[PDB]
């Protein structure tokens, strides 16, 4: 929570960490949202500084009057009109932000509550070996899962092929995507030449070309509407490489740059898919059938080729309370950005202010909906001090963004060897939540 706010306790901590670049969670949502540009590019609106006024009511008064322990949230919204070149700063009230107590809990509508750390798979590429097709033949699959955006999936069939299953759509041959990103047959045949499965898929290819690959990817993405190459290029470039609709996590960029070793020279400047990492993922997928230990991308570095464990605590992270609140705030603020863009047209210029563009109703609704109805916001369990203490340290695998309850198999619940010193193997429910709720270990701490 001190990270989410940016409190000076969290400031000092960062210098010690060496992560010299300190950026709070709210500050991060502001930097992602800023600026807000109109379709004409004439006027921009950028949020700069988060600040907190003192708390509205003490904890005891909140619990007595059925209130929410909260503090007012202000931002510095600077608007710029490029046409008249004028600047209008301001201090805008975002909403009454629920605050965490000193005991680590929240007060929502007069009831004390705890936000359980959720167990979710970290972004990146994950390879698995699917035996048990119709025939005793090892088919290897890989999923590229981001922090936000559209998923990517590469599979191999019973018959030897390679295809891209994109957004649950039917699997189109991967050569379609290769030629859609600008590659030509003479160019891709080179890199995958040692793989005959790719050669067989190109021999079984339906069409060979760049613009027609764009248009066919388009018609695959687009039902019931006429195909066009221009909108094909726009949508295909906007879904993955554009930072708006696609969020590759910093954790995700780190995972993919460690797994594929493509860029290890500290290039964290941008978190997005690089055409080289898609080339690396496809080359990794096809070479995993052979399984040679050392693999070198055209730029990669001696990457070991092996399938990934889904339950390993290097590939399974946890979203703490700050990140969950940040992920609801992000959605609320994106809706507010929609409202801002809608206002920017109908309103009379030279009458607008950063106050008239901003509508804080969706953000307040998002926060209220989270703390009221979210599965991860749980009624605090206080029979004795110990019950609350562990409840605040629980790790829950169920919730939005993680696996559902019907997706919980025996293999996710078992004690993993990576749980040693991280999650306690003894403390867990006896009933249907067995293996789904586990207590954090004593000496363990959560990574940034």
């Amino acid at each position: 929570f001190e990270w989410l706010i940016g409190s000076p306790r969290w400031r000092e901590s960062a210098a010690e960490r060496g992560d010299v670049n300190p950026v709070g969670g709210l500050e991060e949502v502001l930097y992602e949202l800023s600026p807000i540009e109109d379709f004409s590019g004439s006027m921009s609106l950028s949020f700069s500084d988060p600040r907190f006024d003192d708390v509205k009511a003490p904890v005891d008064e909140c619990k007595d009057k059925d209130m929410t322990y909260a503090a007012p949230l202000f931002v510095t919204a600077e608007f710029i009109n490029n046409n008249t070149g004028e600047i209008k700063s301001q201090t805008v009230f975002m909403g009454d932000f629920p605050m965490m107590t000193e005991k680590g809990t929240f007060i929502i509508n007069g009831t004390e509550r705890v936000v359980v750390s959720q167990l979710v798979r970290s972004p990146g590429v994950y390879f698995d070996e699917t035996i048990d097709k119709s025939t005793d033949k090892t088919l290897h699959s890989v999923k590229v899962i981001p922090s936000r955006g559209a998923w990517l999936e590469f599979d191999v069939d019973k018959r030897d092929t390679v295809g891209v299953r994109i957004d649950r759509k039917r699997r189109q041959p991967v050569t379609v995507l290769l030629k859609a990103l600008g590659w030509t047959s003479e160019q891709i045949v080179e890199r995958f030449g040692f793989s005959e499965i790719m050669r067989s898929t190109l021999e079984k290819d339906n069409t060979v070309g760049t613009d027609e690959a764009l248009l066919d990817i388009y018609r695959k993405l687009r039902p019931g509407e006429p195909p066009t190459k221009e909108s094909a290029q726009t949508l295909l470039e906007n879904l993955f490489f554009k930072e708006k609709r696609y969020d590759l996590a910093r954790v995700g960029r780190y995972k993919v740059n460690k797994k594929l070793g493509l860029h290890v020279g500290e290039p964290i400047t941008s978190s997005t898919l690089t055409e080289e990492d898609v080339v690396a993922t496809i080359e990794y997928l096809v070479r995993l059938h052979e399984g040679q230990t050392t693999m070198t991308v055209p730029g990669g570095v001696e990457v070991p080729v092996e399938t990934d464990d889904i339950d390993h605590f290097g590939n399974r992270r946890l979203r703490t309370v700050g990140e969950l609140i940040q992920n609801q705030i992000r959605v609320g603020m994106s809706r507010m950005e929609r409202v801002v863009r809608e206002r920017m047209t109908t309103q009379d210029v030279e009458a607008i202010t950063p106050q008239t563009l901003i509508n804080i109703r969706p953000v307040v609704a998002a926060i209220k909906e989270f703390f009221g109805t979210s599965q991860l916001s749980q009624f605090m369990d206080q029979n004795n001090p110990l019950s609350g203490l562990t409840h605040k340290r629980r790790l829950s695998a169920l919730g939005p963004g993680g696996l559902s309850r019907e997706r919980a198999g025996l293999e996710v619940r078992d004690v993993h060897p990576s749980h040693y010193g991280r999650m306690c193997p003894i403390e867990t429910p006896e009933g249907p939540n067995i293996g789904l709720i586990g207590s954090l270990s004593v000496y363990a701490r959560v990574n940034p």
Binding site: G224, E225, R338, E342
Partner: protein
Amino acid sequence: TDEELTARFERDAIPLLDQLYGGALRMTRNPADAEDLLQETMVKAYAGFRSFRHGTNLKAWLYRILTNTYINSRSAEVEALEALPDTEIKEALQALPEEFRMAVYYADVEGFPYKEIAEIMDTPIGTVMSRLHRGRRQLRGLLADVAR
């Protein structure tokens, strides 16, 4: 040229229904309500399509129409004991003369009009109302419980 205007409507704004359906679902989070809202916007647009000005970019008019139309939008124990009589109001009524008891019953319990009570009891209006008020008084004197 009314039907011709509707024909060029079928030829002009119909390609925009998909784009502005995306626009309506972009505000209404429920796709079914997005369908309903797009249908309402289309009824509004076709009702006043003749009023629409001819222009180079017609669709922005529909965009504003869409945004404006959206912004415009007892146990068995209790049941068994309820059946039993009060056996206090019962007794007090039994003490009343049957002639006055039936009168106060019809005019007070069942709430007939006085003429209709006179019709039921075969007796004229004077007899009915006299029995009515006299039985009222005798019953008032009979019970002082008044729900305690």
